[PDB]
Amino acid sequence: FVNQHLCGSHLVEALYLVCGEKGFFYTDKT
Amino acid sequence: FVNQHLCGSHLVEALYLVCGEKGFFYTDKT
Amino acid sequence: FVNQHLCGSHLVEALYLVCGEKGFFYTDKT
Amino acid sequence: FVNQHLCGSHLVEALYLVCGEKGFFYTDKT
Amino acid sequence: FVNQHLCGSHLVEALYLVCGEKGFFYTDKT
Amino acid sequence: FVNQHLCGSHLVEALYLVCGEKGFFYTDKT
Amino acid sequence: GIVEQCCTSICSLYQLENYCN
Amino acid sequence: GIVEQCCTSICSLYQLENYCN
Amino acid sequence: GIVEQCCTSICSLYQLENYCN
Amino acid sequence: GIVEQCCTSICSLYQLENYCN
Amino acid sequence: GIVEQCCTSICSLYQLENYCN
Amino acid sequence: GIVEQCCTSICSLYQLENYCN
Ligand SMILES: [Cl-]
Ligand SMILES: [Cl-]
Ligand SMILES: [Zn+2]
Ligand SMILES: [Zn+2]
Structure with missing residues (x-):
């Protein structure tokens, strides 16, 4: 969707x- | 967990x- | 979108x- | 296809x- | 969303x- | 930038x- | 399965350990 | 191109071989 | 933060250098 | 196994296919 | 540091947790 | 080529840019 987990990976x-x-x-919070 | 040498990314x-x-x-500063 | 291919990678x-x-x-089917 | 040693992930x-x-x-059990 | 950057990676x-x-x-343009 | 040997992917x-x-x-043709 | 559980929502290390042999 | 073909839908190994030299 | 800036939109190398020590 | 064939030595594509379900 | 313990040698899980915030 | 400069030896950033289109 905007998957911040795979993106942060x-x-x-x-x-x-x-x-x-x-x-x-x-x-992962700013 | 895995038992190896992790290096780099x-x-x-x-x-x-x-x-x-x-x-x-x-x-990574030695 | 929810790209299950890149996510499974x-x-x-x-x-x-x-x-x-x-x-x-x-x-990749459950 | 690639002709190398693939290891790890x-x-x-x-x-x-x-x-x-x-x-x-x-x-990977030998 | 369809993030072509992570997908091209x-x-x-x-x-x-x-x-x-x-x-x-x-x-990344065709 | 990183100062190492990048190889493979x-x-x-x-x-x-x-x-x-x-x-x-x-x-990669030598 | 793993693909309907760990793509829509993130899975921790303990959740990913279920699918190991 | 590869980016409009292999992101919206998954590309197999044979489909990815088209773009090789 | 990095996660609200470099996921919705792509970040270049110069943008990613801000968060280095 | 898989490691001693593809990591210790080099595997081909059809040797890769031997580990697919 | 982290490299000389986990890359030069092998780390465990609880040694990995020593570098989390 | 690219491998013998950046993999056999170490490359800099401006040596990396030499292979961009
Ligand atoms: Cl992704
Ligand atoms: Cl590697
Ligand atoms: Zn991804
Ligand atoms: Zn690697």
Whole structure:
């Protein structure tokens, strides 16, 4: 529908590629 | 659970599966 | 829309991580 | 088709692509 | 909704598996 | 950006993330 | 089945463990 | 194109082979 | 947040770089 | 099994089909 | 860190939970 | 090609952009 679970599954991988050594903080709430 | 070496995106992927609504922090700084 | 194909693509990976040595039987019909 | 070593989730991923509506059984017990 | 971005993310991997040595040309416009 | 060896599907995955609407050509012929 | 349960709504690790052998 | 054919409806391996070089 | 911005609409690499440390 | 054929060594398509239901 | 425990070596589930918020 | 530069060795971002259409 807008399945935020499967979408976040892609977002976290994209963030692992983009951030690199910096890392990132991920929260499924904003 | 799986008993292997998770590396790369896979790492974060499992952090997405285990944590859930809690969220996770990802820092690969050795 | 509710694309069960892309969703099952994630489900099978999550099941590979969760089951581990046990394995799993997957059918896209119930 | 690709001629490489598929391992980890990738393995199941191709089982998801090749089988289809038939389904597959995944058992990594050596 | 029909999120063509996440769907193309799966399509490109499926194409990498299917084409193999041949390769493929991918464009998100037809 | 990440500083590692991308191989397999991962390769194309980053081509999907970096290029975007431009598109990419994928040929692994050595 | 797994496909009518874990696509419309998200399934946790414990819910996904049911379908393991 | 591949994106108007293999997103609304699922594409098999044979359908995905059309777009290979 | 990232989830209300990068799911309804696609986020580029530059947009995804905001949430890095 | 499946790993020792397709992960330890390389599998073909018709060897992949041997594990479908 | 996380890599040297779960990638260099093998992690368990409760070692995975140590990096959740 | 692309593999011998980014898989055999490590690529940068602007080396990645060399394979975009
Ligand atoms: Cl999706
Ligand atoms: Cl890998
Ligand atoms: Zn998806
Ligand atoms: Zn991988």
